[PDB]
Design a protein around this ligand. Structure first.
Ligand SMILES: CC(=O)N[C@@H]1[C@@H](O)[C@H](O[C@@H]2O[C@H](CO)[C@@H](O)[C@H](O)[C@H]2NC(C)=O)[C@@H](CO)O[C@H]1O
Ligand code: CA
Ligand code: CA
Ligand code: CL
Ligand code: CL
Ligand code: MG
Ligand code: MG
Ligand code: MG
Ligand code: MG
Length: 537
């Protein structure tokens, strides 16, 4: 054809709503960040957080780690031809400070203010010392001031005709079931780009996905695929995948459940430990994930990928509570006083109340749904009554934000050090705010823990940072805050029918996934090249 179209699948939808607002992660399309709004810097997390400079050409932190200046690349244009400058960066950060519902990461608690030094330099002032703040700053979308300052309420703005900095800003085709996002005519890095457009089909769940990917209809995906060698790999020599290791997955319990009986159970550490011992984590990996994961028996959730960081003494002390031990679970329930007093085989609370835990995972995330159903069965074998629900992701998510759920199975962000998981999963500041994600919504709060998290990057002292990690590990482990299950994978499938250049095990340039929130996907698409099709008629 006359243009190359790359078929991608970042996110499940039942119908596409035209929304390219990069601040509205709960309602926008998942090709907005990176592809329409390019970041200042992409940190290559798989390669030691190596900064890859994009719209900024440099940054420099102060010696006291209380401020940082970014240098903006000259000669970059917005897709409408106007210049990308410091003005746009300063506006974007002031916008998020003024409208904190647009803060999806917690940036506002780190950056007290921004200043334009000149047309191509921005200075950020910090609330506390933080050597990790350039990483945090890179998370914030930069939008064109000359457009957005004329918008009446950016927090409700759907941005249907976007002006962007990234490689793909033109909305070529848009229907409820398909849209096509084509090349920015003024793209600053055009000589590096060999893909003409992104083609985005509507896919609601893993079952619908399976049929399409096995039939060779996709190019770049990151979905769960069951029995992948037999179903997908075997269908074509052009069907490939690479699954580098990812983050923790866990059952999260609501410490503020409004039901008296359920609250009584979930806030009890003996109960959380018994729940944890009932689980057969390797069987969950084997059945629900077809072997694609590693047991996580760290009460702190750290997982085995951070051996240099782990306090082995703490891990070993609480490991027994995070290992399969059904008899141990029954004994602990008995010692704690969860006794069955109405002859149905299921333990009741110390106050004598019956209860059944409702465990949720998102609709269509079938690997997680199957994990929950296995756990329900395993819990029954120690006398804990539970049953599964698979609500739509938005309903699942909202139940966690509002604290109406009982237990949720979830994955987490994964980074180059343990802070990505521990901060996002446990910092109580992330339990409030209309832009917050689900990850900290157990509503367990510990002042000492927050203090340690907020000091993680405060000293430039490697040994002290390690001791802070050991402190965090001890607190979370001894309180068994969540029930960690496994460490998962960055699922990624690619097709060599129409494109080459893919990252893979022999070319492991970075995280290969197509999800929003993987900024490396920008770097990945800049490596892809179309293949000339085999002739036919
Ligand atoms: C940390 C986090 O929330 N990551 C999300 C991804 O898990 C999610 O991808 C979905 O993951 C499910 C669980 O393994 C899979 O069943 C499902 O196939 C997969 N969906 C897609 C479209 O890849 C993505 C997309 O919802 O969002 C990430 O934020
Ligand atoms: Ca290139
Ligand atoms: Ca009972
Ligand atoms: Cl401003
Ligand atoms: Cl631990
Ligand atoms: Mg203003
Ligand atoms: Mg301007
Ligand atoms: Mg080009
Ligand atoms: Mg010390």
């Amino acid at each position: 054809a006359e243009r190359s179209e790359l078929t991608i699948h970042p996110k499940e939808f039942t119908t596409f709503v035209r929304n390219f607002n990069p601040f509205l992660g709960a309602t926008n399309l998942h090709t907005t960040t990176d592809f329409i709004y390019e970041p200042l810097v992409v940190f290559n997390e798989m390669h030691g957080n190596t900064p890859v400079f994009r719209l900024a050409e440099n940054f420099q932190m102060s010696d006291d780690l209380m401020s940082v200046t970014f240098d903006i690349r000259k000669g970059v244009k917005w897709s409408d031809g106007e210049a990308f400058t410091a003005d746009d960066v300063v506006y974007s950060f002031n916008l998020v400070k003024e409208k904190p519902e647009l803060d999806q990461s917690g940036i506002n608690s780190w950056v007290t203010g921004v200043e334009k030094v000149n047309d191509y330099q921005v200075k950020f002032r910090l609330s506390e010392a933080n050597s990790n703040v350039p990483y945090e700053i890179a998370k914030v979308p930069v939008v064109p001031k000359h457009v957005w300052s004329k918008v009446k309420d950016p927090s409700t703005f759907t941005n249907e005709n976007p002006v962007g900095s990234g490689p793909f800003t033109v909305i070529d085709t848009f229907t409820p079931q398909l849209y096509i996002q084509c090349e920015n005519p003024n793209y600053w890095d055009a000589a590096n780009l060999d893909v003409d457009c992104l083609r985005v089909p509507q896919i609601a769940n893993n079952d619908q996905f399976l049929g399409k990917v096995v039939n060779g209809e996709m190019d770049w995906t990151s979905s769960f695929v069951p029995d992948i060698d037999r179903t997908y790999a075997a269908a074509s020599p052009k069907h490939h995948y690479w699954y580098p290791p990812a983050g923790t997955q866990a059952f999260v319990v609501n410490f503020k459940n409004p039901d008296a009986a359920k609250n009584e159970a979930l806030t009890n550490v003996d109960f959380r430990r018994a729940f944890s011992m009932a689980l057969d984590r390797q069987t969950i990996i084997d059945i629900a994930f077809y072997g694609g994961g590693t047991v996580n028996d760290f009460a702190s959730g750290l997982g085995y990928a951070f051996e240099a960081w782990s306090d082995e003494k703490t891990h070993d002390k609480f490991k027994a509570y995070n290992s399969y031990n059904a008899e141990g679970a029954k004994k602990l329930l008995a010692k704690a006083g969860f006794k069955d007093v109405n002859k149905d085989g299921f333990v009741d609370t110390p106050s004598g109340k019956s209860f059944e835990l409702l465990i949720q995972s998102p609709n269509g995330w079938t690997d997680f749904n199957n994990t929950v159903q296995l756990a329900v069965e395993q819990l029954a074998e120690v006398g804990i009554k539970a049953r599964a629900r698979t609500p739509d992701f938005s309903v699942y998510n909202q139940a966690m934000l509002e604290g109406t759920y009982d237990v949720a199975y979830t994955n987490y962000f994964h980074g180059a050090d343990p802070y990505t998981y521990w901060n996002s999963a446990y910092n109580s500041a992330l339990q409030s705010g209309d832009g917050m994600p689900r990850f900290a919504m157990h509503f367990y709060k510990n002042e000492k823990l927050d203090g340690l998290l907020n000091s993680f990057y405060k000293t430039a002292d490697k040994q002290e940072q390690l001791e802070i990690a050991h402190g965090i590990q001890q607190i979370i482990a001894q309180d068994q805050v969540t029930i960690p299950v496994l460490s998962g994978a960055y699922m990624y499938q690619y097709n060599t029918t129409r494109f080459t250049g893919w990252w893979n095990e022999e070319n492991p340039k970075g995280r290969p996934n197509i999800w929003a929130g993987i900024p490396e996907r920008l770097l990945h698409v800049l490596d892809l090249k179309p293949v000339k099709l085999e002739h036919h008629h």
